Symmetry: D2
Subunit: 392 residues, 4 copies
């Protein structure tokens, strides 16, 4: 088994099959032709290796998919136009009216909205469970429980889930476990190795790494991914990834190990700095010894990540003053870019929640979320320092 | 109002607002930053004009959208990752359990599958009607009829509906009319100017014109398009169009009038040829006086289009041999490319239908569909001529 | 049928020549080889590719399959044996002239040249020992009299940028066959759709593919077409070693995309410019108008003989000079004020202070570039809109 | 002054100047329009500071140029279509017949060919000198000497020049010192800070880092760079860089520090390994204590680089066997890619030399050059080990 970095660069491609091209050619084409109509018929009937239409399948996409499958340790991958494309295609495929889906307590805003205002209004029942409490989950299981879906760590408060414990219970009741692995990437956490059936990503974030594409990935078993490809994507979402963006995403993945090492090292220093400060009420960072689920985080994640959540004394008032004073960090939603970013979840990425939904799903009105970038740590420390002083 | 060609090249863009750039800069960026967090919050609340995240809205995509809205004569546009993206995003936002959707008798294969095996399995009721029979449409209207959805001409047999006559019935009962205008483009037919509320396109086809991107477009009122953007696209499909692909689509749109004029002139010559050949049993082309809905075609489309459907005397056997013999035409699904294409709908684009459904909804075995390209007509005729000899 | 030895039509070749989807997994559009390098199955195979015995690929500055397709397609459209794609029109011109000329050689030049070409010749290669001579290439007797034993290359544009002076390409070629000179024609203005100098006896043609070939103003690119021997030499000396003007595969793909509508775009550019030129010739403010489609065009019969249609470019002059030209160009609302040509968007510019600013004031009067000259590149917009814009701007120039 | 990594990500760009775009919009446009013709005439005269034509200058290219200038510590940068673009545009601007150029003893093959068979045949005089030998260099200066040009380390034997020493000598005659810094990049070595006037790069290599573009960079003083832009590029080469490629190059530059750290760390391990092997006669790697110019290397380079050259005892025959047995390394020219590469300079990168010129200018038959990539070192080690086994 070649190492992670080796596979991120090489897996599924030999230059000698494409005229010696070191970088795979980009198949920017909507359709593919057939040598005979019988050959083509066979492609549609599903009984043939090949290609017919890029919404169903495309060789640039297929390479990205195989490579992502290798990094997560799954059988099959699927590339989509966005993270939301990956989540919707998956959930539209696996659920029908009268199925239940058990969710983690805190979700990304558009995932929450899709669940409650989207698929939830088509007869699919939803219940929220703390996915670190295996007893509370087991109690929540019903015979209608088809899917278990959660993020770990969760956007935006960093709440962990016990992936292996959830999976044991799901295996017992015949439930499909789907884990949003956006924050960690396969370099830091591999939920499939801990018993998840499917992983989904916003490849828009760390996997791309450079903020220039929107994309989604699904990885899991051949049987589940085939269904998601041929139903969710083909017929229910049409969330097709551009071959151009797929080739940029592959370009990004080639440095994923190096970039994540630096995001993690920078974020550790900033977290430890923010811990020592009087303006800071509390911090959620997995790599601080004081993190409430430090032990569980270490059994699942090989490093503590690039994301920090924290609150100031002064609440939202001091939050605004801090964020508005940042000169190197930018004020923006998104994460996992080379550029360091800051945002206010309640009024931005989680503004789809009502104030009461925000309150009891653990999205504070004072919370600031930092995506720590690849800039020099001293420049980033200086920027945070002066913004804290301006926030007082 | 400037002419169609002028608007396809210029509408919505002034080089002076982007440093004099004659071609608009490509905004290949997932996120946008804010000068203050209150500016950001204001954007997320709708109260400020600006950008935050490309899945929701992006300036390259917005120029495409505004240009397409102008060409169709509608108020607002939306760009998506595929035609299926446009259709699913639209219908997921407009429909809920208990609603009825009235459908044209014949639909594109994945549209049919989406309706019967996707949204129709989430409690939405479907009924098919002959949209050319206005009395039968009226007779099928119920108070639960929320949406009337059809293609005109229909993929693949070219069956037409009287859009203004359908719209009248919709206005009487309070239904929303959604027209798939893929085949005509806004250059040949503008269903919004005949009372339709929304038009959808596979921009993958004629609008791109060159076979290199997958894309979809929705045009209609600001009110409907805003909902499709903020619910269907944002939450239920994630079918986000790449700025790179949007830029290519705008490039293609600049020659739309010229290309369609050639597609049409070529197809007319080819159709007249085919109509005189001894191997041909039947042909559906709207520009032939023998076309059953010739008067309606001349009234509603400014040219008869680039698409031909016909049947050979020897059924499926002769169809196969014909298609296998083509040397200049390629055997492929898709349409509206520079390259001339041929396919067998029953085994390909409409293979999601069962044999019973195909017979019921008008997709015979025997049917061949041509997308007539931009090649020299003498070359296309010689290719068709020899393939017809080969068909015996 | 009338037999499979018939050449497919121009439009067919612009779409299909050199490419079969079945050789690339069925891809209808050719995959883009956006790769700098190519690998070898063995070291010997690799040594053979640098030698030039093994057919294949090693490094995109020398050669690349996306570029090769573009090159073969342009060769087909021009009726030449081989093609070469470069980073710009100037790339094509410089790579060609650096390959063909050495100190002591003389190049005979058309009386009027694109500004950067003029500058390259007089201030570039001309300063490294190459002798230059300008001649009216419409005057075959003067060309014959200017030929010397040192004359290695004859180089000109037809029609010339920006005054549209023409040369008799077949007449020039005949003189060049008799004396032994290589004839190089810049065919940017016509494209192979309207004029094919290699079929009239030229050895090499060069293009700014940035213009009509692309058609959409989004790339910079150059093309050279000619004999296998001359194009190979240009590839391996000019491009590889003396300019490094390598075309991006991304841009070559976009250029190919544009070439697929070349016939349709040129037809419309030409029909639009014809209506505009006839309109302008009837207007009070116009001193003179040069459009090959008007019988008043000084070399009208030569234009009709070499060009299948009269082009998309108009050069004209208002009564009022510089003065009135400024006020016309400034009142345009649909036309843009800009250099370049052959875009979907209609453009207007002023050679003497823009594309020919590199010429001294004296050199502009000597090589036929007036102070009142206004050049129009007529685009693809609706002709009624372009007429309305030019009509209102004429009024405002009074 | 912000750190290297900060500047490689941010220098010269503020999102707030471009509608908040986190990533700069790509100006894929050939031409730029004017609000008036006076304004237009002023751009061509250099009196107004706008844009007119992308061969001269373009905002995407200018951003790249300013960022590279910041990384090298120079006043001004220029982006070109290739490394050869950069070298030729530079030398054509600076040299005229009767001028002399003093050259490093070993040069990249196409540079050598350009010099001997290109500009050298237009009356420019060439002399090769050992650029570590300051008394020989002093002695070789003549009144005709106008440019001193070399690579350090030299492609392909790793010979170093004393850049500060060369610059001291040049200064006594007003000569212009041009350094090809391709191998090191500005992260490892900054010749302008050691007294060079101009640096050139094949940005195709480490700067891009991903093998997908061809590009060149010149950095230097404003007056020299202005002339290279307006004479060498504009008029003498036309080596214009695509804005698309310039955007990809900027993307690559954002991880330059992280990639170079890994290239160097990997190469250090492989060099240490190869230096102890019985099949190996000689090795050139700056990081080895036995490297002849170890002390000088450490004065100029912050890390010893990702390139290794070595010779096997079995000569050219053993060389061939080694290369053919490699399974993870590819056989290819080029360097500075994520993928590890190996080549034979005598029959590839330096095949433009004759046998006697190779022997004379230090390029052996038997030399193998490795460009060590970003793959897992344990995988690279295994591949080199088995290939060494197969060579003997
Ligand atoms: C502005 C958007 C942010 N997130 C997105 C996201 C998505 C959805 O991913 P697309 O945006 O559709 O690619 C899915 N899963 C997770 C854990 C996510 O964070 C953000 O928080 O900053
Ligand atoms: C291979 C695809 C074909 N059609 C597609 C299509 C779509 C769906 O559009 P995307 O493919 O998702 O962009 C929507 N609406 C119509 C009238 C269509 O023809 C085809 O028939 O050849
Ligand atoms: C702004 C540029 C214009 N022309 C360019 C051009 C070139 C040089 O071509 P690149 O620009 O290097 O692609 C070569 N040959 C001809 C007959 C040309 O017109 C223009 O005049 O409008
Ligand atoms: C195949 C090419 C290789 N080298 C190139 C190169 C160039 C020329 O750079 P473009 O190739 O024109 O970008 C300039 N300067 C140096 C030190 C170089 O190594 C190679 O060695 O493997
Ligand atoms: S968002
Ligand atoms: S399809
Ligand atoms: S120019
Ligand atoms: S090379």
């Amino acid at each position: 088994l070649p190492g992670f970095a080796t596979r991120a660069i090489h897996h599924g491609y030999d230059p000698q099959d494409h005229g010696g091209a070191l970088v795979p050619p980009v198949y920017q084409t909507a359709t593919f032709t057939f040598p005979t109509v019988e050959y083509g018929a066979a492609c549609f009937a599903g009984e043939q290796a090949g290609h017919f239409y890029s919404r169903i399948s495309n060789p640039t996409l297929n390479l990205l998919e195989a490579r992502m499958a290798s990094l997560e340790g799954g059988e099959a991958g699927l590339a989509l136009a966005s993270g939301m494309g990956a989540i919707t295609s998956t959930l539209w495929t696996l659920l029908r009216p009268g199925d239940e889906v058990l969710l983690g307590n805190t979700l990304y805003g558009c995932t929450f909205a899709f669940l409650h205002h989207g698929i939830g209004e088509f007869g699919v029942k939803l219940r929220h469970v703390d996915m670190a409490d295996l007893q509370a989950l087991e109690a929540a299981m019903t015979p209608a429980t088809r899917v278990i879906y959660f993020e770990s760590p969760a956007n935006p408060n960093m709440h962990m889930a016990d992936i292996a414990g959830v999976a044991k219970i799901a295996r017992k009741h015949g439930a499909t476990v789907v884990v949003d692995n956006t924050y960690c990437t396969p370099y830091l956490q591999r939920p499939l190795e801990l018993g998840a059936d499917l992983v989904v990503h916003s490849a828009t974030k760390y996997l791309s790494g450079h903020g220039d594409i929107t994309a989604g990935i699904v990885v899991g078993s051949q049987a589940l991914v085939d269904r998601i490809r041929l139903q969710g994507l083909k017929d229910m979402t049409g969330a097709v990834l551009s071959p151009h963006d797929a080739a940029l995403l592959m370009r990004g993945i080639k440095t994923l190990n190096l970039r994540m090492d630096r995001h993690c090292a920078n974020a550790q220093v900033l977290a430890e700095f923010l811990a020592r400060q009087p303006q800071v009420e509390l911090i959620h960072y997995p790599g601080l010894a004081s993190f409430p689920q430090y032990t569980l985080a270490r059994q699942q994640m090989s490093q503590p990540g690039g994301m920090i959540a924290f609150e100031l004394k002064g609440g939202i008032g001091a939050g605004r003053r801090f964020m508005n004073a940042l000169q190197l960090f930018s004020r923006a939603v998104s994460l996992g870019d080379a550029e360091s970013l800051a945002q206010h979840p309640a009024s931005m990425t989680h503004s789809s929640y009502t104030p009461e939904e925000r309150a009891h799903y653990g999205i504070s009105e004072g919370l600031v979320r930092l995506s720590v970038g690849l800039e020099d740590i001293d420049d980033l420390l200086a920027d945070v320092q002066q913004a804290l002083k301006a926030s007082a």
